[PDB]
Structures are given as C-alpha cells and as structure tokens.
C-alpha cells in the first residue's frame with residue numbers, strides 16, 4: 081500500500097519518485113525528509129478539526145468583496161423541500177431556524193448543528209454574514225434565480241472529515257580555475273564570468289583568453305575576482321557565459337558559492353550548460369539535466385584552508401524625504417548614514433535602503449542585517465516588493481514571508497500565481513516560501529487545489545521539473561485523499577488530450593458534422609464516459625462536473641480545434657449545467673495572467689462601491705501548452721450577432737441596429753433598461769482594463785455579450801502593447817450606450833464617468849500592479865521580459881503624475897478615442 085501511494089503520486093505529478101533517488105543528492109534527500117514530516121504533521125492536525133473548522137478547510141467561504149427573497153431549503157435524506165421568504169439581511173442561522181420549524185411541523189416535532197449546502201456544489205453558507213454577502217446569494221439576485229440549499233448536519237460533515245484520513249579570515253581575491261569544456265561551434269571561443277548578488281554585480285566581470293572554436297576546450301586558468309573572499313554575501317551567485325567571436329552566444333550557467341548547508345564550496349565542479357538566446361544572473365542555479373546533449377564546463381573552487389557562513393549570533397555582534405517617495409550617488413550616502421532614523425521613522429522605506437547597502441563589503445551587510453532583525457513588520461504591499469529578485473539575501477526574504485503571513489486566504493489566492501513564479505528565483509530547495517505555500521495549502525483545500533495545478537502545469541519545463549515535482553510530492557504526503565481527487569482530474573485531462581488529437585486528424589479528412597458524430601461515439605466508450613464524469617472542475621473545485629451530455633459536446637473551428645464539453649447534474653438543477661473547453665496547442669499562461677489582473681480590478685472597483693458587471697471566467701493551464709477555459713453560457717460573439725441573419729428575432733434595416741435588437745429579443749418589456757445598463761457598465765470596465773493592460777487586436781470575433789447585456793472579452797494573446805495602444809471606443813457599443821439614439825450625451829457622459837472613476841481607482845493601487853508584474857518576470861513569458869514592458873504600465877496608469885494631470889491626460893485619450901468612433 082505504501083507502494084500504491086508512491087505509484088499514484090508518480091502518475092499524478094508526471095515524474096516518477098525513482099528519479100529523485102537516482103540523483104544520489106542529499107539536498108533533495110533532506111528536502112524530501114523535512115517536507116514529508118512537516119506535511120504529515122499538517123494532516124494530523126486536520127483530522128482533529130472541529131466540524132466547522134473542517135468546513136473552513138475544505139469548503140472555504142465565497143464572499144462579496146432590507147429586501148425580500150425566496151429560498152428553497154431541503155434536508156439530505158429526503159426529496160421534500162420548503163420555500164421560505166426571507167430578507168437579504170438575515171444570517172444563514174435565521175434560515176436554518178425556519179427550515180427546522182417547518183420540518184418539526186410537517187414531521188410533527190437546534191439550528192447551530194448545521195451548515196447549508198449550495199445544491200450540487202462544493203459550497204456552503206455558514207458564518208455571521210447577511211445572506212446577500214455570499215457570492216451565491218449575491219449572484220442569485222442579479223440573474224433573478226431563487227437560491228437552493230440543503231441542511232447538512234454536523235454528524236454528516238464529520239463523516240466527511242473522517243473519510244479523508246491518511247569566515248572573516250580569508251582576505252585574498254576570490255578565484256576559480258576555468259579548466260575545460262565540451263560543445264561545438266563555427267571563429268574563436270571565449271568565456272565570461274561575474275559574481276552577482278541578484279541584479280547588481282559585486283565587482284567588475286572577467287574573461288578567458290581566446291581559444292579557437294575547436295574542442296572540447298581546455299583553459300586551466302585561475303580566474304581572479306575583484307573582491308576579497310571574506311566579503312562574499314551569503315547568496316553570492318557566480319555566473320558564466322560561453323559564446324564565440326571573430327557576437328554569437330552559445331550557453332550560460334550559474335551556481336551558488338555556498339552549498340545549502342552554509343558551507344563554502346570546493347573543489348572541482350562540472351557544469352551542465354543551458355542553450356543561448358549574454359550573462360544571465362536571473363537564470364536557475366541548477367545544472368542542465370539533459371547531460372547527454374549539453375555542454376559541461378569544469379571548474380575548480382580552491383579549498384581556502386571547512387568554512388561556513390557565520391551564524392546570526394556573530395552577525396549581531398559585528399532633503400531626505402524629498403528624494404524618498406532611482407537616486408544619485410550622494411543621495412544614497414545620506415540614506416545609509418541615516419539608516420537608524422529610517423528604521424525608526426520610515427520603516428516602510430526598508431527596500432530603498434536595502435538597495436543602497438553595500439552587498440560587497442561584508443562589514444556593511446552585518447550592519448544592515450542588524451537593523452533588519454528589529455525592523456517592524458510591513459504592509460502586505462511592501463512585503464510583495466521585498467520578494468523581488470532585487471532582494472536575494474535570505475534574511476530579507478525570510479522577513480518578507482514573515483510580513484506576509486497576515487495575508488488572508490482570499491488575498492493569498494489573488495497573488496498565488498506570482499508567489500509560485502518567485503519559486504523560480506530560489507537558490508536552494510528548502511526555502512521559506514515553500515514551507516509557507518505548502519503550509520497555507522494544507523490549511524485551505526482551494527489553495528491546495530491551485531498550487532498543485534500551477535505546479536503540475538510546468539512539469540515539462542526542464543528548469544523547474546525537479547523543484548516542482550518535489551513540492552507536489554510533499555503536498556501529497558500530507559493529503560492522501562486530495563491526491564485521489566486530483567488523479568480523477570488528470571485522468572479526465574488525459575482522455576480529452578486523446579480525444580482532441582482524434583478531432584484534429586479527423587477534421588482534416590472529413591466534414592464537421594461527420595467529425596462531431598465520431599467524437600460522440602468515442603466519448604460513448606466505457607473508458608471515456610467513466611473518465612470524463614463525476615469530478616471536480618479543475619477550474620473551480622466547488623463546481624461539480626457530473627454526467628457529461630455527449631450530445632451537446634462539440635469542437636470549435638479554430639486552429640487547435642479546441643473542445644467544448646457540457647455537463648449536467650440532476651442534484652444541482654440548472655446550476656449543474658456548466659461547460660468547459662479544452663485546448664491543446666497554445667500557451668494559456670498569458671491569458672491566465674490577463675484574466676487575473678481583470679479579476680483584481682473588479683475586486684478593487686468593488687471595494688470602492690463600483691460594480692462594472694465584469695465576467696471573470698476561469699482559465700487554467702494544466703500541462704504542456706494545454707489547459708482549460710470556462711464556458712460562459714448564454715453568450716455570443718459580436719461577430720455572430722452582427723451576421724444579421726434572416727428568420728431571426730433581430731433583423732433590422734441597418735447593421736448598426738442589430739446588436740440592440742439582440743438585446744431587445746433577450747429582454748422583453750421593462751427589462752431592456754437593465755441590460756443597457758449592464759452593457760454600459762461592463763463596457764467601461766473592459767475599455768479601461770484593455771487600455772491599462774495594453775491589450776490590442778480587439779475585433780468583433782473576440783468580444784462577447786451575455787443575454788443579460790454584459791459584455792466581456794476572450795482570447796488575449798497580446799498585452800503591454802506587444803503586437804502605445806490607443807484607448808478604444810467602438811461605434812456600435814457607443815450606439816448601444818446611447819439607447820439607439822443618434823445623440824444622447826446624458827447616457828454617453830454617464831458612461832465617461834464610469835470610465836474615469838474605474839481608471840482613477842486603479843491609479844490608487846498602481847503600485848500593487850507594478851509589484852505583481854515585477855514578480856511575473858520570473859515566469860519567462862515572452863511579452864513580460866525586460867523593463868520596457870513594466871514602463872508600459874507606468875505610462876498607462878500615469879503613476880508619476882498628480883491625479884489632476886493623469887485624469888486630464890486620460891481625458892485627452894478618451895476624446896481621441898471618440899474621434900475614431902465614426
């Protein structure tokens with residue numbers, strides 16, 4: 081059985097556990113040891129949780145950032161239900177007392193024993209919050225549906241919990257021996273090295289002699305460095321580039337100069353190199369695993385007598401403000417002199433001072449650290465900054481995790497994406513960020529859910545395979561039940577990948593009706609119906625994907641021929657009628673990120689009382705150029721609506737009418753105004769989000785509308801202006817805002833306000849978006865690479881100007897956009 085588990089993990093994580101031993105690497109060993117233990121202690125705790133505490137682990141609350149409503153409640157072991165009238169202000173408990181009072185009458189005769197389930201979902205309503213505060217009641221009110229819930233008893237939830245059981249001496253210059261290499265090229269070879277502490281180098285770089293592009297090369301030279309050894313900061317990273325010349329790059333490689341156990345390194349090292357596009361401090365510090373086909377440099381670290389980085393005990397012994405909101409040489413000096421007054425009077429300026437400290441003078445690091453040890457904790461926003469590669473020092477990083485523990489789960493969920501990329505910044509395997517992420521992930525099943533997919537989705541990337549594999553194993557050890565649930569998911573994705581391949585081939589030999597019919601047959605096979613049914617949606621674990629409606633599944637006509645898969649649930653009703661789209665052949669990362677940034681805007685907007693009726697649909701990469709998109713139902717592209725067909729509700733005299741005629745046929749009588757309002761509001765959000773993010777190549781095929789009026793965008797392969805992308809106002813939306821009328825500045829100008837509010841709200845959190853993109857640089861995304869891309873955001877938010885100017889500027893942009901509307 082111990083064998084079984086091991087083998088299911090191997091299958092889950094897409095790499096086999098045997099490959100971890102094979103390496104004969106004790107760092108991997110220790111990581112595997114320490115992390116298993118830690119994780120197992122987390123599951124121990126979980127099986128003693130109170131029933132309510134268990135619910136908070138497994139089904140965390142889905143909350144919003146007087147008036148009457150109708151609710152259906154029912155009990156578990158019965159089909160009989162009651163419909164109570166209540167107030168949106170009422171707590172869940174009030175409902176639960178109704179229900180039981182009704183039960184005790186029809187059945188002829190204790191609220192807190194209970195939680196309410198959303199029917200057909202992994203979703204529960206509990207806590208002291210007005211019904212209307214829950215996303216589910218909230219949502220129910222817009223669409224006009226009546227919430228449906230089930231009284232679940234404490235014994236029934238405990239039954240669930242149950243089921244789920246498992247030093248200063250050395251003053252001479254630093255040097256290595258460059259010895260030999262083993263690749264091929266066209267013309268002379270040369271090497272280049274520099275000692276880096278993150279971005280900043282710690283001395284001028286040095287070089288090789290010229291060696292003809294021959295071998296198999298052999299240098300046997302001490303490369304000597306412009307820095308004394310006793311100065312090397314703890315996170316000294318030594319970086320090599322190998323290229324050729326008469327500039328043509330070939331390979332790079334980095335290593336940490338101390339091992340993971342603080343011991344400085346000697347003697348000889350063989351270096352398996354990574355392929356080129358010249359010196360790459362940001363690259364990983366682990367060798368290329370394709371040792372067969374890769375160039376391997378050999379070097380010799382010269383045993384300097386063991387030696388350890390000194391323990392913290394030892395380190396403990398050993399016109400200001402105007403600039404303080406990129407500073408000159410002297411400006412830096414003042415800051416450093418004032419460092420105690422910075423700690424005492426401006427603790428939030430920690431970062432600007434870290435960047436002034438002299439990472440290549442050991443004495444100064446010792447003093448900086450000495451301050452950091454009594455530095456007050458910082459706001460979440462400031463902590464997010466300290467995580468950047470600009471702050472390699474492990475003592476700073478630890479302080480940043482410390483400051484970040486106060487992240488709520490919802491906040492944590494919000495920035496999870498970037499915290500995983502940051503892992504790519506880590507120099508060793510056992511690190512503060514990992515324990516944190518795994519700890520928080522073992523405390524919340526939703527966090528656990530997404531950490532795992534973020535990790536699984538990158539197992540094809542050689543530079544991260546081992547790091548991520550090791551983490552997913554650890555999670556598994558501390559959550560056997562959840563591992564079974566995710567295999568269920570991966571098994572489904574496995575089938576879609578085979579089904580999607582069939583469809584690509586098929587669709588090149590035959591007609592779309594013919595191919596759809598074969599898909600349906602292939603899906604009807606026992607192995608498929610079994611693998612595609614009765615799972616949690618990898619896009620949102622609280623969504624249950626029950627029986628797949630084969631007759632309703634099909635495929636899109638785009639290049640990669642993505643799949644459209646529908647699902648139903650008798651137990652959830654019309655709420656269990658959800659759909660997912662499988663796509664294989666494209667990078668979904670960029671789209672995912674884009675979608676997370678919109679969702680965040682909507683959060684920030686909502687927090688200031690502005691609801692722009694956004695449609696933040698799920699989009700989740702799962703594997704190599706594979707992942708999942710959420711089906712938004714009851715929607716159609718602008719392009720389709722505008723085909724202006726015959727024998728349709730919507731055919732007018734003028735192509736400009738069609739889209740409004742469409743809103744009309746979906747919304748009879750009085751209800752047309754609501755839809756125009758939902759259209760106007762969402763239209764403003766998308767105009768701002770696309771403008772702020774530099775998204776372009778909007779056109780009527782990749783914009784959609786829901787029957788409610790809500791407009792939203794799909795298919796984002798381009799942001800940050802990577803084809804200055806102008807703000808866009810499309811004439812036919814403008815026509816819808818203006819309720820069909822030629823002139824209507826009352827409706828058109830309310831629309832401008834929506835835009836200006838939305839825009840100015842995001843400037844207030846400009847720095848949260850700058851920090852988040854700074855951390856996304858670790859993703860390797862082609863369109864998020866250098867400083868020019870972040871500048872793009874600097875300029876779109878006018879984050880350097882006062883709010884008078886930015887708003888004035890924005891107003892010129894919007895006007896310009898109007899000119900372009902006919």
Ligand SMILES: CC(C)n1nc(C#Cc2cccc(O)c2)c2c(N)ncnc21
Pocket residue numbers: 661663671697699709710711712713715716717794795796
């Ligand atoms: C109607 C078609 C065009 N369509 N396409 C939809 C879609 C997509 C998508 C989103 C981001 C990236 C990407 O490549 C594709 C879609 C959806 N999500 N919900 C409802 N209908 C949808």
